[PDB]
Design a protein around this ligand. Structure first.
Ligand code: CHL
Ligand code: CLA
Ligand code: CLA
Ligand code: CLA
Ligand code: CLA
Ligand code: CLA
Ligand code: CLA
Ligand code: LMG
Ligand code: LUT
Ligand code: LUT
Ligand code: BCR
Lengths: 238, 159, 42, 97, 104, 100
């Protein structure tokens, strides 16, 4: 019905049927063609709506709103965390002299008497007091999150999840409402992937005990040799 | 003894072009119509980008393989790519000054398509159109010279 | 120059001024004296 | 030229039988073995040289290869046969005799 | 370059392989094909000398069989030629020849 | 009209009369991917005027010749930058008078 170059995905700014796979009735669902009866409250109006409420926890619209905000905030924090749990180890295996690049050991760097050099450079942050660090952090993050929940110096009458003034959308990527609608989906999908992968970081720490990039490397060395089933008998009750 | 091939241009025996296989063979007409020079509805900057990519990529070869540093192993390709970059820059300059010299009189006669339907003039043949065409030619030509070097470096069977 | 006579050109002067005088100033000149030749009068 | 108002697209009055018939009229006599080739044929020796030079594909044939003689003679006869077949067919259909 | 005009004037000047004036399997020696092979279907050279597809529905089922066999046979020809062709170049198959490749 | 009965002159069609034809032009708007076209319409946005393009060309060419004379000719290992590497044709003025 179309020509070759429209099939091949040319001609940007033809997007109103491309939101159909992420919003609306006939969108992609959590079990795909094997998920018939989506919850009636998951109408397809919000980003990331795949019809997954098996436990019915979001049946109330207001708790659904609160859960959406929880999801997006967790997603953003988990994206930052997934990037930050791999950046030091990547940089250390590329050769930056980070003293403890593994993430679940990265907090114990501040107890070495050379302090917490940021990239392993003593001329950088050079933090020694974990208590002063925590105090600074508590003050700043309390101000920050209280500003988030009602408003602050960066806009008060803005949305609770996507404020998008000149402080939180300073590149203007989301001025087109369709670009905004699909970027919301990209945000929530990358964020759900990051939350799953951060759960994976947690479990791979508690189970394996090495770094996540070290786990990737020892899996790529001999995958069938070394897997999560290698550590299946680790939590044996003795 | 029928079926003569060579015809007057659009049937006009007094305009003086003599349509001919090399001129109006459907394969030839198709190929020449599909060239960015004759895509009169497309923006001149993009046609210039395509033309410049092509020409910058092609005119690096001579400078690489036949230049004065052609017999130095790793220096031949660099020197040729830079010579081609300079030639592309000169050509962009020439294109710019041509756009300054040519488009001042604004011809008044319309155009047709050898079929009868009058089309709009190519925006390329204006001051703004030719300026953006020359900008596109410069960008595309430097990009194509850089890509010629990249192909010297990454193509498997480059001698 | 140090003390012999001031305003002596540097050693790199020819390498810069021969290209300038032969590739650039002729380019500038021919471009300018091409726009001026083809310039229509109002 | 009172005719020819638009350069007819079918300027070559194509008959797909013409190339096949010229090819067969040349290559079949070109597959007849003769005394001068040592019992071999022109097409046979030409294909033999094609094989001998495809055995080192990048390295092209030499000046002293004899592949060029077979090539040029075979294609002389073949192009001549094909063009004369086209001419004859389109003269038979049209006038010209 | 000229714009080719639509097919209201030119509905079937290109229908060389369909219609009554279509090529047949004996050329000029075919005479006239059977009354059911009328040239609406592809590859109809009028070859039904056994009359096996005299019924229209049997003719439809045979067209299905022929086209599916044709696609499978094209895939099969390419698949028997390709491994042997690349085995003549130095790709070390177990048995590049097709009627021995199954026992690999 | 203009093609009717060898009437190759029309005052109401001076385009066909004078032979003002686009022999190969096509006015189809669709040639390039829109993201690519956007990329290249924005890459040339700064130099899409005559003055800006000539400023770029002047800057690039002057910088290029200056860095070629200062650095690029020596990087190319040009004989004029290496020097004679010999005593040259110094003492051999003429065949008769060997002048310095
Ligand atoms: C006044 C200082 C102020 C500072 C330093 C921050 C700093 C932060 N806010 Mg924040 N906010 C601040 C005021 C406000 N915020 C918000 C509403 C939000 C939201 C809704 C979110 C943040 C998030 C963030 C973080 C990511 C910043 C970012 O998106 O980078 C781009 C430049 C960062 C810690 C995000 C976060 O914490 O996810 C990890 C997040 O989702 N802020 C409001 C209400 C409009 C504010 C009002 O003043
Ligand atoms: C891939 C993840 C991703 C994606 C697609 C989006 C997409 C969006 N966000 Mg969200 N966001 C994310 C992650 C993401 N965000 C994270 C992790 C945070 C917390 C830092 C936020 C915080 C946030 C706020 C506070 C706001 C948005 C807004 C927006 C919208 C406009 C900005 C945009 O298009 O960004 C596109 C994203 C990219 C092109 C990714 C760039 C990759 C970065 C640079 C990698 C490096 C990370 C960096 C080093 C970490 C320091 C920070 C759009 C819906 C705004 C909005 O909707 O207002 C209209 C808004 O107000 N987001
Ligand atoms: C428009 C013409 C055209 C196209 C589409 C290609 C396409 C290709 N060339 Mg290029 N090439 C061309 C003209 C072209 N070539 C010409 C005229 C010369 C001379 C070369 C010299 C050349 C070399 C030296 C190599 C290629 C290679 C390749 C292939 C890379 C994969 C690709 C199929 C590479 C390859 O894999 O073969 C490679 O090493 N090409
Ligand atoms: C009209 C008289 C005249 C002529 C014919 C030349 C001729 C030449 N000059 Mg000299 N020059 C002159 C006056 C002249 N010069 C004066 C008055 C000055 C001082 C301002 C210079 C300073 C000068 C320098 C510093 C250099 C030359 C160089 C050159 C050569 C290349 C051309 C060039 O770069 O010009 C450049 C001209 C000017 C910078 C100023 C002209 C006004 C050429 C042999 C170059 C050379 O020796 O290469 C071997 C070189 O590097 N010229
Ligand atoms: C696509 C086919 C193809 C390819 C990739 C090459 C590639 C090459 N040829 Mg060959 N060549 C070809 C077709 C081809 N030629 C044909 C059809 C003829 C006739 C020749 C005749 C020919 C000669 C006579 C020579 C080459 C030579 C060469 C090499 C440098 C040019 C290069 C490896 C030269 C070489 O390296 O030896 C050389 O001397 N070629
Ligand atoms: C099993 C494969 C197969 C099948 C089902 C058909 C079926 C058909 N062909 Mg096709 N055909 C085939 C193979 C096949 N053909 C091959 C290999 C050739 C090339 C030699 C042709 C060449 C051909 C032409 C040129 C024409 C047809 C036509 C027809 C139709 C009418 C004849 C009929 O009823 O055939 C019934 C067929 C069978 C019952 C298969 C019997 C298989 C036996 C065992 C083979 C005997 C040994 C064999 C000769 C070797 C019918 C749709 C005619 C038509 O109208 O096309 C639309 C027509 O003009 N066929
Ligand atoms: C002839 C053109 C030309 C020009 C204008 C320059 C100009 C420059 N080069 Mg390049 N270079 C050239 C040719 C050139 N070089 C060639 C032919 C070779 C070989 C190199 C190898 C080379 C190296 C290895 C380096 C430069 C560097 C430099 C810069 C000092 C300067 C911008 C240096 C830089 O910092 O940039 C540097 O590291 N060049
Ligand atoms: C969050 C806090 C952000 C502010 C941090 C200020 C650091 C104060 C300080 O002590 O710096 C001290 C530093 C120098 O300190 C040096 O840091 C080095 C690593 O950078 C090494 O570690 C050396 O050991 C250390 O001496 O001063 C600066 O770096 C400031 C120079 C700024 C240069 C960039 C200017 C570009 C700005 C424009 C682009 C962005 C728009
Ligand atoms: C949907 C549904 C449906 C039905 O109905 C029901 C149910 C089932 C319930 C549901 C589901 C859900 C889910 C699955 C969830 C999940 C979550 C997660 C995973 C999260 C994470 C989450 C995650 C997260 C936040 C993360 C974060 C992170 C971070 C901060 C980080 C930090 C850090 C880092 C950087 C590193 C350093 O050195 C240290 C630290 C400090 C460590
Ligand atoms: C038309 C007509 C008419 C009249 O009426 C009657 C008559 C005569 C009867 C008719 C005729 C008919 C005919 C002739 C038929 C034929 C058929 C055939 C031949 C088939 C094949 C057919 C064929 C085919 C399918 C083929 C296929 C193939 C394939 C799958 C392949 C596979 C494979 C390969 C790749 C190789 C490997 O290693 C193995 C294997 C596994 C082996
Ligand atoms: C070199 C050689 C030789 C010789 C050769 C030659 C001499 C060749 C020739 C060739 C030729 C000389 C060929 C020709 C051909 C011809 C043909 C092939 C014809 C045909 C005809 C036809 C086919 C017809 C048809 C028709 C008709 C009847 C009518 C109308 C229609 C038409 C079309 C159908 C030798 C033996 C010593 C040996 C070695 C090699």
């Amino acid at each position: 019905k179309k020509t070759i170059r429209e099939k091949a995905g040319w001609w940007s700014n033809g997007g109103n049927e491309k939101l159909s796979a992420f919003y609306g009735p006939d969108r992609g669902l959590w079990l795909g063609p094997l998920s018939g009866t989506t919850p009636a409250y998951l109408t397809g109006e919000f980003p990331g709506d795949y019809g997954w409420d098996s436990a019915g926890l979001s049946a109330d619209p207001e708790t659904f709103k609160r859960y959406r905000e929880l999801e997006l905030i967790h997603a953003r924090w988990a994206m930052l965390g997934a990037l930050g749990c791999i950046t030091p180890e990547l940089l250390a295996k590329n050769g930056t002299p980070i003293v403890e690049p593994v993430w679940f050991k990265a907090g114990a760097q501040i107890f070495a008497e050379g302090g917490l050099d940021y990239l392993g450079n003593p001329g950088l942050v050079h933090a020694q007091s974990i208590l002063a660090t925590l105090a600074v952090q508590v003050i700043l993050m309390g101000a920050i999150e209280g500003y988030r929940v009602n408003g602050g110096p960066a806009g008060e009458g803005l949305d609770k999840l996507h404020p998008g003034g000149q402080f939180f959308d300073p590149l203007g990527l989301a001025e087109d409402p369709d670009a905004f609608a699909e970027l919301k989906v990209k945000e929530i999908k990358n964020g759900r992937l990051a939350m799953f992968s951060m759960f994976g970081f947690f479990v791979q720490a508690i189970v394996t005990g090495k770094g996540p990039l070290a786990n990737l490397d020892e899996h790529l060395a001999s995958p069938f040799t070394s897997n999560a089933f290698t550590y299946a008998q680790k939590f044996t009750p003795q | 003894k029928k079926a003569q091939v060579i015809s007057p241009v659009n049937g006009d025996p007094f305009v003086g072009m003599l349509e001919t296989p090399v001129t109006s063979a459907p394969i030839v007409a198709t190929y020449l119509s599909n060239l960015p020079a004759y895509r009169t509805g497309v923006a001149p900057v993009l046609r210039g980008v395509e033309i410049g990519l092509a020409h910058g990529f092609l005119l690096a070869g001579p400078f690489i393989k036949l230049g004065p540093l052609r017999n130095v192993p790793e220096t031949a390709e660099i020197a040729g790519s830079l010579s081609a970059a300079g030639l592309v820059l000169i050509l962009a300059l020439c294109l710019s000054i041509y756009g300054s010299a040519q488009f001042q009189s604004t011809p008044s006669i319309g155009v047709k398509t050898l079929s009868g339907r009058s089309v709009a003039r190519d925006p390329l043949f204006s001051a703004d159109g030719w300026s953006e065409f020359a900008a596109g030619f410069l960008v595309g030509g430097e990009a194509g010279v850089a890509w010629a070097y990249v192909c010297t470096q990454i193509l498997p069977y480059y001698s | 120059a140090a003390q012999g006579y001031p305003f002596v050109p540097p050693s790199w002067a020819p390498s810069v001024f021969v290209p300038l005088t032969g590739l650039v100033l002729p380019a500038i000149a021919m471009a300018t004296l091409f726009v001026y030749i083809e310039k229509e009068a109002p | 030229e009172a005719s020819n108002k638009s350069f007819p697209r079918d300027w070559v009055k194509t008959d797909p039988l013409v190339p096949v018939l010229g090819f067969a009229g040349w290559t079949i006599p070109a597959n007849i073995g003769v005394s001068a080739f040592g019992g071999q044929s022109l097409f046979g020796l030409f294909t033999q040289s094609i094989g001998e030079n495809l055995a080192h594909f990048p390295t092209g044939p030499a000046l002293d290869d004899k592949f060029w003689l077979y090539l040029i003679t075979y294609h002389l006869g073949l192009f001549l046969t094909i063009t004369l077949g086209q001419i004859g067919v389109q003269g038979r259909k049209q006038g010209y005799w | 370059r000229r714009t080719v005009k639509p097919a209201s004037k030119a509905s079937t000047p290109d229908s060389f392989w369909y219609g009554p004036e279509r090529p047949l399997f004996l050329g000029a020696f075919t005479g006239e094909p059977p009354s059911y092979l009328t040239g609406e279907f592809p590859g109809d050279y009028g070859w039904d000398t056994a009359g096996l597809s005299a019924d229209p529905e049997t003719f439809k089922r045979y067209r299905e069989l022929e086209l599916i066999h044709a696609r499978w046979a094209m895939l099969g020809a390419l698949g028997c030629i390709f491994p042997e062709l690349l085995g003549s170049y130095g790709v070390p198959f177990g048995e590049a020849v097709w009627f021995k490749a199954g026992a690999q | 009209k203009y093609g009717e009965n060898s009437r190759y002159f029309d005052l109401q069609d001076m385009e066909n009369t004078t032979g003002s034809w686009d022999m190969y032009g096509v006015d189809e708007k669709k040639r390039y991917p829109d993201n690519q076209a956007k990329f290249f319409t924005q890459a040339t946005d700064i130099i899409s005027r005559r003055e800006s393009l000539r400023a770029l060309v002047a800057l690039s060419g002057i910088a290029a010749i200056v860095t070629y004379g200062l650095k690029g000719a020596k990087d190319a290992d040009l004989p004029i930058t290496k020097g004679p590497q010999t005593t040259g044709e110094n003492g051999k003025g003429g065949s008769v008078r060997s002048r310095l």
